[PDB]
Amino acid sequence: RPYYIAIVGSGPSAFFAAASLLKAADTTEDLDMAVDMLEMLPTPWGLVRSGVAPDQPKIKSISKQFEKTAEDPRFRFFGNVVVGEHVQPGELSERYDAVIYAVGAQSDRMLNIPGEDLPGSIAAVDFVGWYNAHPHFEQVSPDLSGARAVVIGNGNVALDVARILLTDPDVLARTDIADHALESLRPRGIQEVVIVGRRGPLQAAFTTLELRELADLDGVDVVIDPAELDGITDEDAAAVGKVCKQNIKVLRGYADREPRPGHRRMVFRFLTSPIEIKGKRKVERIVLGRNELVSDGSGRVAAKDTGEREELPAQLVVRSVGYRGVPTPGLPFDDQSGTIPNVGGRINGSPNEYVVGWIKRGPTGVIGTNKKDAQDTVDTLIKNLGNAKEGAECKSFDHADQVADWLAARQPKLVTSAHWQVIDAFERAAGEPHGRPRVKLASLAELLRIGLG
Amino acid sequence: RPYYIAIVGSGPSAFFAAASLLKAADTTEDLDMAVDMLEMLPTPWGLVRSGVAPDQPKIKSISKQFEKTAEDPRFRFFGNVVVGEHVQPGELSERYDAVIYAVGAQSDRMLNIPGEDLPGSIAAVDFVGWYNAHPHFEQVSPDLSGARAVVIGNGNVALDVARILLTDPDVLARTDIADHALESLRPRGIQEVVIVGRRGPLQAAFTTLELRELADLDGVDVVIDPAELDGITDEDAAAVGKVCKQNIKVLRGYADREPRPGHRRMVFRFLTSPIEIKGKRKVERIVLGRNELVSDGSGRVAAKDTGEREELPAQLVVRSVGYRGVPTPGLPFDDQSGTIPNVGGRINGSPNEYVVGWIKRGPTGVIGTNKKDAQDTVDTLIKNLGNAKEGAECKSFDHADQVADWLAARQPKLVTSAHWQVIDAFERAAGEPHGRPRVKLASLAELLRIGLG
Ligand SMILES: Cc1cc2nc3c(=O)[nH]c(=O)nc-3n(C[C@H](O)[C@H](O)[C@H](O)COP(=O)(O)OP(=O)(O)OC[C@H]3O[C@@H](n4cnc5c(N)ncnc54)[C@H](O)[C@@H]3O)c2cc1C
Ligand SMILES: Cc1cc2nc3c(=O)[nH]c(=O)nc-3n(C[C@H](O)[C@H](O)[C@H](O)COP(=O)(O)OP(=O)(O)OC[C@H]3O[C@@H](n4cnc5c(N)ncnc54)[C@H](O)[C@@H]3O)c2cc1C
Ligand SMILES: NC(=O)C1C=[N+]([C@@H]2O[C@H](COP(=O)(O)OP(=O)(O)OC[C@H]3O[C@@H](n4cnc5c(N)ncnc54)[C@H](OP(=O)(O)O)[C@@H]3O)[C@@H](O)[C@H]2O)C=CC1=O
Ligand SMILES: NC(=O)C1C=[N+]([C@@H]2O[C@H](COP(=O)(O)OP(=O)(O)OC[C@H]3O[C@@H](n4cnc5c(N)ncnc54)[C@H](OP(=O)(O)O)[C@@H]3O)[C@@H](O)[C@H]2O)C=CC1=O
Ligand code: NA
Ligand code: NA
């Protein structure tokens, strides 16, 4: 019989794992694989679909690789299956030789400041999900009519949020952005976005191309007070690394240009932390505080509050201070890191359950970083199966049909590969008349109406 | 106040951690450290004392670094304190800002074959502990009068076991080897040691200098049937790595020399596994089986049993198939790996408990590998303390005296730095008349007789 492997989640780490498993079978005598992928949403691809910005179709095109993997007769997809709800980890570990958890980071890190949950104060997780038509975020529906938005954080997601708020909606109309978001963005309500970083430019988590692309926003002025960069030398930057030296150059380039009255603006503020979000019933203003950089002995510089304060009117606050993993019922979890504890990708205390991607490593790295991660986990998984075989300890298992029928019993509204293909064709066809790659079905009800029709 | 850090264990990873903590204090404004080291034995240094072979005084001399660290007034040692017995992890996490577990790997991996626990069949853990006068292994007392010993495994510990069994006892008489072991070795009972590796020479975990040093055994023939190496090319070796290419060369050099009748012998056998250990009431013979190398799809080659069998008379069997961590009461543990699950060195689910060394990484690497490991953990530890401080969440604490008195209440027979220094001076003085670096006190009773007199 082949080995039966379940993968939970369908993002990059899941697909890289699936490819690794099938390639091992393809290159190894007396080794065969069957892969079942269980996904919470009706649609695959995880953040490649729901995270990467709608103005980034080329980077999204890694999806072609995932499609090639899914063409394999040994591969099956079951969407609209929530592990922890419809089926439990213990049930999966008994019906499969091994199970790989590739669930990513489904929630947000909080600021832990007063006023944070006022209407108008949201996470990038919610805002990105909403603009990319993730069905769990359809009702986020932020008011985008106010003149100023504030984005907290200095990572690349912070730039995505700023860029989408200020991009010419005519440009966005040619993308797979959610129709509901395009509608809210069309009136161009936001006149200024302020990106607020707690440490300095040298500590920014941004990468260079992502900073450079802000120049392509037609008519939008990128504003940086030259005082944010004064005293930072080429030597200081080079001492952090190559990426930082390039970043600093690009930031100086923005600082060197005076903004134009009446133009939309993206403003970078460094050494600044949000202190308190204020308003009667919704966000009206934010209190910002100034930090200084201080060594804490860890080999990092820390931001330390100086006490200095200013208040800035604002109508939207988006915290882009990191995604965060969510515990899965039946599996161990590290609350502080939002990861599943593991040894070499094998789940703590488990002989046959594994982790890959952001649930294993934390929310760091580009899509490509998940490839070696998945390979390493898969190598270990296969080693462990082999050790069980040479010791004659492999499980005894029409098992493929039995499992598929059981999944259907637990979730009658599951979405097979075939039914995903229906959604996919529909969404792409919807984009044709107006020259968009696709128009997404933005709620579970709509996805299932098409998928399960 | 300073931060109070407890370190559990006193081997290389513990001392590297201690140095890292104090250096951070020394190089950081508004950061001060007090380090308490709690050790199960009366004596410090872990495997530097009890593991590294008695014919390796130079490598043991890293102890000088540990001594320099212990000279710091901010550093305290408490030996004969067993964490999990005299004090519990929960009690330590409340009395200290952070606790670092550096307990190493205290038990052995088993072969899981019939006859394994017959008298005369032991682990390298027990055998090395016994010959290095580790007080938990004083009664191992193996019979060394029989002509043949068999050592299982192809790691550097396997070479230590073989080398000590066959070294001229006149040479060992000038070392810090346990007197009880020197007594058993003096009659030169063992005429042949057979080192049995399950995979091939290309897969050996030995390193090169360690293989080369076997040539320095005066009068002992290293025996390798040329057929063990036939068909292994320079190209095959180079494809594994530099160390392997050098190893293969050294092994060929041994194979190229015919053994001499009547000489003591060390024999290398590859592609061989122990199947069963036999005898009426003690080890009398071992059944060996032949393996072939087969890909299991993991990117390793696996050994697979061919079924071929031979029986070899043997009176001692030492399994050197890896050390193994032991669970600590109150802390999580991964049974399969024998490690404590952790995220970046922080213990799963804990805000202030950490791991370093072999309990974190598994039993791999030379002494020096623990240095960066400890540094990385300490960097994280200090970061986390700093984050707690900027948030005003640090514990409220004569605390040094209070803790020391509490330890004395729990363990009246604890061994202070001063009392270790007494043991140390006594043992070294004992070695003077016969030109030995020290003569170790080999039981807890003897250690305490001197230490606490
Ligand atoms: C806003 C954003 C933009 C990004 N843009 C880029 C970019 O432009 N370029 C780049 O290289 N990288 C980008 N990244 C990084 C990239 O998205 C990640 O590296 C990658 O997606 C992580 O893959 P993953 O498999 O761990 O998780 P995910 O991609 O998050 O996939 C996890 C999958 O698991 C499913 N799941 C979760 N829980 C369950 C459950 N209980 N049961 C069943 N299924 C479950 C989810 O629905 C999801 O489909 C971006 C990340 C974000 C957050
Ligand atoms: C036989 C042997 C020979 C070796 N020879 C060499 C060599 O020649 N060169 C080289 O570079 N490396 C050598 N090594 C590797 C080296 O010993 C390890 O890399 C290193 O010692 C691991 O350090 P550690 O701190 O993790 O653990 P250890 O050195 O094992 O120290 C752990 C300490 O924790 C204490 N402890 C355990 N449990 C408790 C408890 N519950 N409460 C209080 N204390 C506790 C122990 O008593 C011990 O003192 C050898 C290893 C072995 C096994
Ligand atoms: N094109 C690309 O390569 C992209 C890549 N990503 C990749 O995905 C991950 C996640 O991105 P994301 O921006 O969410 O996270 P990070 O890069 O870690 O940046 C987090 C920032 O948040 C900041 N943060 C965290 N807590 C706070 C508080 N309390 N106040 C203020 N600021 C805070 C953090 O600041 P810090 O460095 O800790 O001082 C980062 O700037 C990260 O590795 C990205 O590079 C994401 C989007 C892309 O477009
Ligand atoms: N001078 C030095 O640098 C020294 C260094 N050490 C270092 O300490 C660690 C531990 O050494 P140790 O020899 O205990 O372990 P390893 O190097 O991992 O070697 C283990 C070997 O055991 C073998 N093993 C494991 N299970 C079995 C079974 N079931 N049957 C037969 N053989 C088995 C294993 O074989 P494998 O590679 O898995 O096929 C290694 O050869 C290792 O990293 C050493 O290099 C130890 C002693 C030294 O002298
Ligand atoms: Na981006
Ligand atoms: Na050695």
* Given resolution (angstroms): 1.8
Q: Name the residue with tokens 């890909």.
A: B295
For A285, the token pair is 């203003």
Query: Residues B141, B88: one domain?
Result: no
Q: Residues A245, A378: one domain?
A: no
Q: Which among B265, B235, B51, B232 has a CA at the least distance from the CA of B155?
A: B51
> What are the backbone angles phi and psi of residue B322, rounded to the nearest 5°?
115, 145
- Please, which residues bridge with residue B343 across strands? B346
DSSP A373: H
How many domains does chain A fold into? 2
Method used experimentally: X-ray
**Which residues fall within 8 angstroms of residue B311, CB to CB, at 6 or more apart?**
B278, B285, B286, B287, B288
Q: How many CB atoms lie within 10 A of CB B24?
A: 23
Contact of B124 with B162, CB cutoff 8 Å: no
Closest CB to B348: pick one of A28, A334, A383. Answer: A334
Q: Is the CB of B11 under 6 A from ligand 2?
A: yes
Residue at a domain's end among B275, B302, B323: B323
Asked whether residue B439 falls in the same domain as residue B351, the answer is yes
Provide the CATH number for the domain around residue B253. Answer: 3.50.50.60
Name B262's Cβ contacts closer than 8 Å, sequence gap at least 6. none
Which residues, 6 or more positions from A19, have their beta carbon under 8 angstroms from its beta carbon?
A65, A69, A374
- What are the residue ranges of helices labelled H in B96-148? 124-131
End position of a domain, from candidates A323, A355, A374: A323
Cα–Cα distance, A345 to A380 (Å, whole number): 8
Are A343 and B349 within 8 A, CB to CB?
A: no
Q: Are B363 and B11 in contact (CB under 8 A)?
A: no
Residue whose CA lies nearest to ligand 2 atom number 14: B366
Q: Which domain holds residue A331?
A: 2-45+63-107+324-451
Assess whether B26 and B57 both reside in one domain: no
In this complex, the residue of B300, B337, B383 whose CB is nearest that of residue A298 is: B383
Q: How many CB atoms lie within 10 A of CB B344?
A: 15
Token couple for B224: 């390798």
User: Which residues from chain A sit within 8 angstroms of residue B29, using beta carbons?
Assistant: 295
- Which residue's structure tokens are 């991607």? A357
Looking at the structure, tell me whether residues A289 and A168 fall in a common domain.
yes
Residues B217 and B362 in one domain: no
Residues B204 and B99 in one domain: no
Pairing between β-strand A285-295 and β-strand A272-278 as defined by DSSP bridges:
antiparallel
* Amino acid at the residue A111: L
Strand partners, B195: B151, B268
Cross-chain Cβ contact B300/A383 below 8 Å: yes
How far, rounded to the nearest angstrom, does the alpha carbon of residue A216 sit from its chain's CA centroid?
24
Query: What atom of ligand 1 comes closest to residue A128's alpha carbon?
Result: 1
Find out whether A334 and A341 touch, Cβ atoms under 8 Å.
Answer: yes
* Other Cβ atoms within 10 Å of B414 Cβ, number: 22
Per DSSP, chain B holds a count of helices (H) and strands (E) of: 17, 19
CA of A14 to the centre of ligand 1 (A): 10
Q: Does A224 share its domain with A277?
A: yes
Q: What does DSSP say about strands B285-295 and B301-313: parallel, antiparallel, or unpaired?
A: antiparallel
Spatial separation of the C-alpha atoms in residues A6 and B143, rounded to whole Å:
52
Please identify, among A288, A323, A358, the residue that sits at the C-terminal boundary of a domain.
Answer: A323
Is B332 found in the same domain as B220?
no
Query: Do B298 and B337 fall within a single domain?
Result: no
Which chain A residues touch B372 with a CB distance below 8 Å?
none
- Give the Cα separation of B426 and B443 in Å (integer): 14
Question: What is chain B's length?
Answer: 453
Local structure of A179: helix, strand or coil: helix
Look up the CATH number of the domain holding residue B389. Answer: 3.40.50.720
Judge if A92 and A131 occupy the same domain: no
First to last CA, chain B: 35
Closest residue to B386, CB basis, from A298, A349, A379? A298
Q: Structure tokens of A229?
A: 């960069």
Looking at the fold, whether A265 and A119 belong to one and the same domain comes out as yes
